[PDB]
Amino acid sequence: AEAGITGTWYNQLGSTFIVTAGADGALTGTYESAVGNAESRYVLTGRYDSAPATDGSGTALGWTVAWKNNYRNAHSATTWSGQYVGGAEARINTQWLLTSGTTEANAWKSTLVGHDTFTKVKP
Amino acid sequence: AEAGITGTWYNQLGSTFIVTAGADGALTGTYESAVGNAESRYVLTGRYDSAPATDGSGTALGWTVAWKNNYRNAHSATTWSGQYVGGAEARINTQWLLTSGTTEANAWKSTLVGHDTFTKV
Amino acid sequence: AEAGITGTWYNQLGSTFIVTAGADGALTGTYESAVGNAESRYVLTGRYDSAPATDGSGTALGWTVAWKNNYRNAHSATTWSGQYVGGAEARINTQWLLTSGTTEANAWKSTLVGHDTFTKVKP
Amino acid sequence: AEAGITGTWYNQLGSTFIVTAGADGALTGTYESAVGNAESRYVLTGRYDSAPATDGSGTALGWTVAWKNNYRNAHSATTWSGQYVGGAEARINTQWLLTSGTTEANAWKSTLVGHDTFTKV
Numbered sequence A, C: 001a002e003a004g005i006t007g008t009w010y011n012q013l014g015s016t017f018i019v020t021a022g023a024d025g026a027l028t029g030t031y032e033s034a035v036g037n038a039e040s041r042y043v044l045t046g047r048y049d050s051a052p053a054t055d056g057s058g059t060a061l062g063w064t065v066a067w068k069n070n071y072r073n074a075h076s077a078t079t080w081s082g083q084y085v086g087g088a089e090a091r092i093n094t095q096w097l098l099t100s101g102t103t104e105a106n107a108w109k110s111t112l113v114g115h116d117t118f119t120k121v122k123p
Numbered sequence B, D: 001a002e003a004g005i006t007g008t009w010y011n012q013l014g015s016t017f018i019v020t021a022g023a024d025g026a027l028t029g030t031y032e033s034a035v036g037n038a039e040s041r042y043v044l045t046g047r048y049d050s051a052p053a054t055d056g057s058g059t060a061l062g063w064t065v066a067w068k069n070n071y072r073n074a075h076s077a078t079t080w081s082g083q084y085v086g087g088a089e090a091r092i093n094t095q096w097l098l099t100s101g102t103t104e105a106n107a108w109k110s111t112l113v114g115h116d117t118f119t120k121v
């Protein structure tokens, strides 16, 4: 549901995610990371299943943040792939891939993988 | 390198995606796959880092495709994270995560991972 | 440290992991999964850093379980890659890859990725 | 297919691993890489599913290498998960996770992921 995803979310690292889910399946907002070579807010863009299922299945979504803004440029991009689960305590459980640009030679070590869980605070 | 991300790319599977790279880091376009519960074009939105470094590194980027369009809804979304490299043969090398919406009970098996290499050939 | 890893561990799904860390960096034991097309115990083999660092850095390790025993055969294998962190509450935090054998055609969907956290109960 | 996993394999990077596949699912051998804080041979231990299905599927397997030997200790371990396929050109297609031991503080960036294809060429 767009509404349910829309809001302010935080994860276990202390990062802030502000997103708006649009009617057409779009996600736009800004990400504030608590870690990494990242300072201030970064623009995020993603997509979600505007028409999930009835049942108590999560809503699949994903989004990308390139870590370049007017203050910094880490030359990397992270994509989070997960599911939104609503209820009294809504969560977005994700797995992410962080790719740094590298020379052909170090391309084998350009991507990190992890997982983040977000808890909603505001709409 | 710059601009050159813009165009039509194809992968091993036969998938095709057309993207437009905007001066400030946005990626917009459509994705048409060859495998899965997919049928036609899907909208894709991503970001790419517009000021890559000047050591011969690739340009980091990523995009998402929710697999829902006016014809099908596979209740899943794929995110590709990778880097673009130009030259006589430009390619985008990526790793992807495909998450399907599941009930709590099947959450452990909701995400597939793979890799795709796209070229303009 | 071999000792610290040796023991009985459980994760959030309810699976049992019984492992012995040998002096030479080896890990052997059995895995009892609570989910999947898996019944009874399965043999596991892995390796760990017998000489970690001083500091409060985790000990990197990894192990594999092919899901075939005398009772079942899911034709898949899972490898867990993570770190052991000791202390009063020792944990093994991992990320895993589950690959199912497939035809060339469905190879794109042969691997699942997730993460498990194990808590120690016994040696 | 069976037995055929046993042998010497090489990957794109130039890494080489020699493995022995035992009748009951064990994989044993040595791994020598071409990249990273690695120097010489490392011991590898894995498992492979000894009764693959009879639809033309690959044989699922996986192995681990802790990057410590008598010469170096990179305080990391790599696990490769994939499947073997035989034929005139047998190959092992894998995806790997490389975890480095870190302090809690850097736990978020402890694991790299990639893919390797090994052939006997």
Ligand SMILES: N=C1N[C@H]2[C@H](CS[C@H]2CCCCC(=O)O)N1
Binding pocket: A011, A013, A015, A032, A033, A034, A035, A036, A037, A038, A067, A074, A076, A078, A096, A098, A116, D108
């Ligand atoms: N809030 C989170 N931040 C880290 C993880 C996923 S992306 C990462 C921050 C990286 C910042 C930029 C960088 O270091 O390249 N979750």
Ligand SMILES: N=C1N[C@H]2[C@H](CS[C@H]2CCCCC(=O)O)N1
Binding pocket: B011, B013, B015, B033, B034, B035, B036, B037, B038, B067, B074, B076, B078, B096, B098, B114, B116, C108
């Ligand atoms: N070009 C690719 N197609 C498959 C992989 C990653 S995304 C995937 C197609 C999935 C279609 C929808 C589905 O089956 O859920 N790469």
Ligand SMILES: N=C1N[C@H]2[C@H](CS[C@H]2CCCCC(=O)O)N1
Binding pocket: B108, C011, C013, C015, C032, C033, C034, C035, C036, C037, C038, C067, C074, C076, C078, C096, C098, C116
């Ligand atoms: N204890 C765990 N079991 C599931 C995850 C990782 S492997 C998986 C069980 C799979 C069983 C065999 C199968 O279904 O193929 N953790």
Ligand SMILES: N=C1N[C@H]2[C@H](CS[C@H]2CCCCC(=O)O)N1
Binding pocket: A108, D011, D013, D015, D033, D034, D035, D036, D037, D038, D067, D074, D076, D078, D096, D098, D114, D116
């Ligand atoms: N053949 C491969 N070599 C690199 C990738 C995955 S494992 C890795 C070598 C790592 C060496 C030790 C290290 O740098 O930590 N594939």
